[PDB]
Symmetry: C3
Subunit: 284 residues, 3 copies
């Protein structure tokens, strides 16, 4: 696209940039391949667990089939895998893939477009494991945050005269994210405290460690994406391009693969009375 006052051509958000040669080196391609392989493996494992998923009483034939919330995390991984497959194709075809082409929600040819479909699922699943209140609201807040990030990317990659708008959108996102983060942490802490005071002088003591570790670590590890934005060329620029791709791949692996594996481990050790305690949690 052309801009007034200059002859420079800007390829962001246009089909012209879709046909440009790729700007990535071998490191980014290797990171994309590794993330795709890991996501495929985790998707297959979660699908296998969902198929052979007896209930907490180990009596229901298809427990995840009738109560599909247990499949929610699986969905994330599956869609995440899709969001990487296209990337892989790009590195095989040698054409540009960064912030060019059509805007499709759930497809990661834009920086935060793929997260806009899976992040609410992640927040809902994390809050649902403790039967916490304010599940859909946090998902809506996260959806708005990712929309703000997408607009920040559009403003950052465009005409220089409209560069400060990127910072403005980033600030908006950060403000609301801080609010949501604090709320989520408080809610999680309260819920876990109640669970700890419900399981006193009672078994299932080992599974509580796994649940606590998973929920707390994978709720606190969401600060990585704003820090990456701060250090990427859109911010300070401490790490150049082709290294923010590796950082995003590592963040996606930690946020999705490890979280799904932790939930799979937790669902393999809990039993009826802990399920009843979890049900009692969401009653007050």
């Amino acid at each position: 696209a052309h801009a007034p006052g200059t002859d420079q051509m800007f390829y962001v958000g246009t089909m012209d940039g879709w046909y440009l040669d790729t700007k990535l080196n071998s490191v980014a391609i290797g990171a994309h391949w590794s993330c795709f392989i890991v996501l495929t493996i985790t998707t297959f494992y979660l699908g296998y667990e969902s198929w052979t998923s007896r209930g907490p009483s180990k009596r229901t034939s298809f427990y995840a089939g009738y109560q599909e919330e247990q499949n929610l995390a699986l969905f994330v991984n599956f869609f995440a895998m899709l969001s990487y497959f296209g990337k892989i194709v790009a590195d095989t075809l040698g054409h540009n893939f960064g912030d060019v082409g059509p805007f499709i929600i759930g497809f990661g040819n834009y920086r935060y477009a793929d997260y806009m479909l899976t992040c609410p699922m992640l927040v809902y699943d994390l809050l649902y494991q403790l039967r916490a209140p304010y599940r859909v609201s946090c998902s809506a807040i996260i959806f708005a945050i990712l929309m703000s990030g997408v607009l920040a990317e559009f403003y950052a990659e465009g005409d220089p005269r409209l560069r400060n708008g990127a910072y403005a959108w980033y600030g908006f996102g950060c403000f609301w994210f801080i609010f949501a983060y604090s709320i989520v942490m408080s809610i999680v802490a309260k819920q876990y405290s109640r669970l700890a005071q419900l399981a006193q002088d009672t078994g299932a003591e080992h599974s509580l460690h796994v649940l606590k570790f998973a929920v707390f670590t994978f709720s606190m590890l969401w600060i990585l994406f704003p820090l990456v934005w701060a250090i990427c060329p859109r911010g300070f620029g401490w790490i150049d391009d082709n290294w923010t791709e590796v950082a995003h791949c590592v963040c996606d692996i930690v946020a999705k693969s490890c979280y799904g594996f932790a939930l799979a481990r937790f669902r393999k050790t809990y039993d009826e009375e802990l399920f009843r305690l979890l049900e009692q949690l969401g009653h007050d």
Copy 2:
């Protein structure tokens, strides 16, 4: 974009128009600022009410947290605020924002793209207050109507040879809107009549006035948007550009801020028996 048979350049739906200088005067900018401020204030107030929301029995700790339908209206305002924030940034950066750039659902850089995410929420919330039937169906109809409006905008702002298609889409939308409007009015009337015959010789007589006023006024006041389309330059052209922005800001304020404030007022006076009557309404 270029068009056959002419050298004229059309900037609708392109990234070229995203970098163009703004066409708005100070009045439209002031209207955008006022609407953003009002939406921010209402979002904060609704969030505060949702946090300190005891149930109708005034016993539940987090009533809106576990039954999140009460938060629905809040969501609208929040997203509406987002849809204006970007607009604000545009007026600060001095670049064009009308029907240019990427197409993101829920972002108001296109005329009716932002309404496509919040209008079904508004219809569902309005029909849910009376426990009325046909809630999701009306939301789907409204979603289709806003899609028709978006396509009408695309046809209107494009090549002149394809201008009549705008009118065609407008007609489609109007037809279905008339159908939905009649259906909604009938349903609301019937439900309120039943409520009036359920609360006879019973208290809670003051809150019925507030509920009736809110539901009836904010269901009838949806005719304003087709009239604005009729009088805007896309239709007759009685009011020029930079004044349809003020009209849309006023319509958004009335449809969202006042509706949320009215529901907040209603939820502050009703009690257990009116809640039981509302539950009895959705049983037949």
Copy 3:
């Protein structure tokens, strides 16, 4: 859009192609008109049935109003009609409509963009009639399949150097589709077998034929779209353009109009005990 190394201009995904003259002959226009008329008729009939829809006990006033799953199929037809109306306008205005213009989910100006909104509804409705498990999961799989098809279309209609990516995406879609197809067939078979062993020595024997025919035929007839893709110019090229439009119109008619009519016929003959059997089906 321009591509490096050549002066050829590619109109896919651009606003430039929106203003180009139409490439369709009279046969494609007639097929579009026939499909639009059929979808309009079925939408009106399904709306009439939904309005005058007594329950299985023939006692509830608005059965579909309070339990809106019965309206789900109707929604499909309605949206399908919208997806054709715009097409009709294009043939009246004489401008290009194939894979050009804005990308709107649910609007069929791209090949598989309209199916991405109605196909999950179709899968959920088909699996819900037997109270089968894994309803939302199959809908998500189908949504991913249609996204893969859309990306395949983008790669196929673009620069020749990036043509093999179309095949790659097609393969991805086919793989996952095969998985989903097998799963769906197995589930349906098991559910129907249980229903057959629940209605033994019991009436409602005529409605079982209609249910079996509808579910089995309209689950098996989903293989037509991959075969059309295989034989269309994007694949082997056995049938040229302007004949894949007729094939897609016929496939849409069979998949939506006939399915809705079959469900309407089935809902006109079943009664209380078959409803209780259907409820018993989803319990194990």
